[PDB]
Design a protein around this nucleic acid. Structure first.
Ligand code: K
Ligand code: K
Ligand code: K
Ligand code: MG
Ligand code: MG
Ligand code: MG
Ligand code: MG
Ligand code: MG
Ligand code: MG
Ligand code: MG
Ligand code: MG
Ligand code: MG
Ligand code: MG
Ligand code: MG
Ligand code: MG
Ligand code: ZN
Lengths: 91, 58
RNA sequence: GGGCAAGAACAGGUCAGUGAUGCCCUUAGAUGGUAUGGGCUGCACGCGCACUACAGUGGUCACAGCAGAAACAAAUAGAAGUAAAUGUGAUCGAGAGGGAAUGAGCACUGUAAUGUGCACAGGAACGAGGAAUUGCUAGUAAUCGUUAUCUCAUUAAGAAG
RNA sequence: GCGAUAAAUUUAAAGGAAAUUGACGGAAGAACACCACAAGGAGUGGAGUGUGCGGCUUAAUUUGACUCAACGCGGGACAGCUUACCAUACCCGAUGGCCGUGUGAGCGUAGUACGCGAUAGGUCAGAGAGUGGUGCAUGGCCGUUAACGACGAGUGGGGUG
């Protein structure tokens, strides 16, 4: 997918910090909150959707990504956070 | 595209004194950090992070 | 004066509007993207729809003057913009009507002229149209301009007002 | 010419009978309408140009649509983009199994010894993508019948239907 290891962990932490992501299709521009190329962010999240970790809904020109509960844990193992840590959407 | 030859375990970059102290055998780049070493072939000395080739006057 | 507008139909049109879609096909030497160019605008020829005409109920010069309403740096020949038919006086006198093909120029838009504007030359057919054929009953037809409407970097002889 | 009267062969029904609903009539009777006419008015068809269509040419001149209801139509006024077509060049690949890998998978290079490192290796399954095909596999939306007077439900009546 052609992302650096730094860029990969930047997406992992964002997607855990906030339980959602929003990406614009057919764009060579940079994602406002990450400073990563839009097509590359789409391609990264694509894998998480295929793995069944993330829902995808496509509306007009935007892809809305939602992290499932049964995948918060997988991303918590992957990102090696403490067992007490949860997203802003989870009390 | 072409095939990539491989040189196994890279240890040739260094030399070891009788005291066990180690020093680089190839010379080192001034502008890419001293941790980047410089190749040799004929009139050419060359570098990695910059692809710059020096041409010797010999 | 518009707008909304039965039931039933049609193997009527669109997979080239669609993260609407079944099935077949291709898929790193791609039928996927991108970039630089060329074409879509080629020319013996037959057709459909529009635009200027064939003059005197005209052409040319100047002067006025009126819309739907309200937006307009500057510019010394000239190089987008707030009507035009029209009203008065002059002029021209029966191809001084008409502006097609073309020359060396002078500018503008643009990443790039091949596109557009301007000045000078040049001056083709056409002298009211065979067989046929299309709308239109009143502020209608026909005439005359105009779009802070749509296309639009620049381009209307197109639509929609 | 008449009277009287066979076979071989062929075939699933027969312009067989009466009635019913439609479609049609160079049948009758009512209505209606300048996409009909009468009474009129302006044109189109002829000329030059703008634009679309066929034919032929080309490396490519990408393509749909054909009586009304194809042909300034696809919001189709194409220098790039649009753009599907032609010439050259460059770039890429969900996941899962197996195997192989930091003693270095693969990548960059003035390509061989230097720089970067799991990211992007091979093979089987399986995804996804495509202005690629089929509107005679569809949905949606349009146009046309038609802007026409018709249109079905419940209860009663008649007929074997
Ligand atoms: K005519
Ligand atoms: K049309
Ligand atoms: K349909
Ligand atoms: Mg059909
Ligand atoms: Mg064309
Ligand atoms: Mg004249
Ligand atoms: Mg048009
Ligand atoms: Mg007899
Ligand atoms: Mg008549
Ligand atoms: Mg004509
Ligand atoms: Mg009709
Ligand atoms: Mg191109
Ligand atoms: Mg394309
Ligand atoms: Mg498609
Ligand atoms: Mg059909
Ligand atoms: Zn260097």
């Amino acid at each position: 997918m052609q992302l650096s290891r730094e860029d990969q962990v930047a997406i992992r932490k964002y997607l855990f910090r906030e339980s959602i992501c929003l990406v614009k299709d057919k764009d060579n521009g940079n994602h406002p909150e990450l400073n990563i190329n839009n097509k590359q962010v789409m391609k990264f999240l694509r894998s998480y959707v295929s793995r069944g970790l993330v829902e995808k809904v496509f509306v007009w020109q935007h892809a809305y990504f939602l992290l499932k509960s049964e995948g918060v844990d997988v991303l918590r193992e992957e990102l090696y956070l403490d067992e007490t840590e949860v997203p802003l959407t989870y009390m | 595209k072409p095939k990539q030859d491989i040189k196994q375990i890279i240890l040739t970059q260094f030399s070891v004194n009788k005291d066990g102290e180690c020093k680089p055998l190839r010379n080192s780049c001034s502008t890419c950090g001293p941790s980047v070493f410089l190749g040799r072939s004929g009139n050419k000395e060359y570098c990695g992070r910059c692809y710059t080739v020096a041409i010797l006057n010999k």
